[PDB]
């Protein structure tokens, strides 16, 4: 039970090299997670690039790991940024759990925001992603 062949490739450069690993890692994050957590700084590093636009796919893997650790606010954010790979109709243990936390977060924000404003959900004061 090793993620090490795949994890090793993230530390090398060329976009092709990064792509080949990502998609292998994606399927088995939930399964392989103990090893994958230690490579977490590097996976965040893929995300922070915007010349390499498979940022969203990094983000999705990273979210899974963030959940398992118990940083739920952080996972939720990365899950949003993943976009076309966050699908809520798939309904796994992954998807269900971060969805729960997402409604939670809007609700919290929506208390504070109602007292200030009466139009906020139509505006860019709060996250369109959250809204969508």
């Amino acid at each position: 039970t090793t993620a090490a062949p795949l994890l090793a490739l993230l530390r090398e450069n060329q976009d092709s090299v990064k792509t080949y690993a990502l998609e292998s890692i994606n399927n088995v994050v939930d399964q392989l997670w103990s090893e994958i957590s230690n490579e977490l700084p590097d996976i965040e590093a893929l995300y922070d690039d915007d010349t390499f636009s498979d940022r969203e796919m990094a983000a999705l893997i990273a979210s899974k790991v963030y959940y398992n650790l118990g940083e739920y606010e952080s996972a939720v954010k990365y899950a949003l940024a993943a976009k076309d790979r966050f699908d809520i109709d798939e309904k796994s243990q992954f998807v269900e759990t971060i969805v729960s936390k997402s409604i939670e977060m809007y609700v919290q924000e929506a208390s504070k925001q109602y007292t200030k404003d009466e139009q906020f959900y139509t505006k860019d004061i709060i996250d369109p992603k959250l809204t969508s």
Binding site: E96, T97, S100, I103, E104
Partner: protein, 180 residues
């Protein structure tokens, strides 16, 4: 759906806390009430000690009370008079004249003098030299008391009295205690 479960869960955490905390609140609360009850209690004029002369059948007991003279009182509704007996030292109410408790009965040594000694401490192992006496004393006292049935079956009578005569104070009084 998940949200609903977590809340359900928060309920389970909350009840255990109330239960532990609630039980201590009862105990401490009770301690305040208890003192309060004593504070009220203490304002009685007290009870008299009295001695039962005799129980009667009428639901009355004749009591010779020690601070005062002698009184006929009507015992409590919580006991009979066949739930009592004569020679008991009693606590009688000065207020309602009912035997609130019975203590203990007057002890067997009484009058100018007289000594009763329960469990005699002497034995034939406490004095020696009694090889001559041991067979003799056994038949005269032990065998009739311990077996009445023998004496009866034989048709020998039980002796009425025994007289012991000897040099004084050697262990004559001591032997009597042993056999007892």
């Amino acid at each position: 759906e998940q949200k609903i479960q977590e809340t359900e869960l928060k309920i389970r955490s909350k009840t255990e806390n109330v239960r532990r905390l609630e039980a201590q609140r009862n105990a401490l609360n009770d301690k305040v009430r208890f003192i309060k009850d004593e504070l009220r209690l203490l304002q009685e004029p007290g009870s008299y000690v009295g001695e039962v002369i005799k129980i009667v059948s009428d639901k009355k007991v004749l009591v010779k009370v020690q601070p005062e003279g002698k009184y006929i009182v009507d015992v409590a509704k919580d006991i009979n008079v066949k739930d009592l007996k004569a020679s008991q030292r009693v606590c009688l109410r000065s207020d309602s004249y009912m035997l609130h408790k019975v203590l203990e009965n007057k002890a067997d040594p009484l009058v100018s003098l007289m000594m009763v000694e329960k469990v005699p401490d002497s034995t034939y192992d406490m004095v020696g030299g009694l090889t001559k006496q041991i067979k003799e004393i056994k038949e005269v006292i032990e065998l009739p008391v311990k077996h009445p049935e023998l004496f009866e079956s034989l048709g020998i009578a039980q002796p009425k009295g025994v007289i012991l005569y000897g040099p004084p104070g050697t262990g004559k009084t001591l032997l009597a205690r042993a056999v007892a």
